[PDB]
């Protein structure tokens, strides 16, 4: 919800965009965050 | 006549309903002085030289 507080500057929430890469592309399951390398 | 001004700085915030707030900004007021100088015959020269030298 901190996005909701971030949009506290709005003029009043629909969106349409592509993504800037994050850590989703999977090759090793992580039941907990051990972070990862980057190659 | 000689003119002197003792200046404070005191911000006052007044709400929509007239409720007021008070804040003196200067602990000790800053002081200023003024006077009309009328000089001539080597006194004008003294004033001019001294004031030009001082400046600020």
């Amino acid at each position: 919800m901190w996005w909701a507080l971030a949009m506290l500057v709005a003029s009043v929430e629909v969106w349409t965009a592509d993504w800037q890469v994050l850590g989703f592309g999977n090759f090793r399951t992580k039941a907990v965050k051990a972070k990862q390398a980057k190659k | 006549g000689v003119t002197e001004r003792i200046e404070w700085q005191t911000d006052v915030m007044i709400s929509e309903s007239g409720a007021e707030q008070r804040r003196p900004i200067r602990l000790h007021p800053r002081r200023s002085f003024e006077a009309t100088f009328l000089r001539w015959e080597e006194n004008r020269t003294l004033l001019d030289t001294t004031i030009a030298g001082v400046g600020q």
Binding site: - | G1, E4, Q9, E20
Partner: protein
């Protein structure tokens, strides 16, 4: 207890606050004499009630 004819005036004395920040004093002579001033007083009612914010 006094008679009606025992008074000068019943002038108001409301809550007042000096208006201008810097005071102009006209010294027509040294401190021994004329030093008139032109204060301005703003009369109102002080309203804010201070219950200081708890757990500072």
């Amino acid at each position: 207890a006094t008679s009606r004819n025992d008074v000068r005036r019943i002038g108001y004395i409301p809550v007042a606050r000096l208006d201008v920040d810097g005071i102009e004093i006209k010294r027509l002579t040294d401190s021994a004499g004329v030093s008139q001033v032109s204060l301005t007083f703003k009369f109102f009612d002080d309203r804010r009630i201070a219950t200081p914010l708890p757990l500072s």
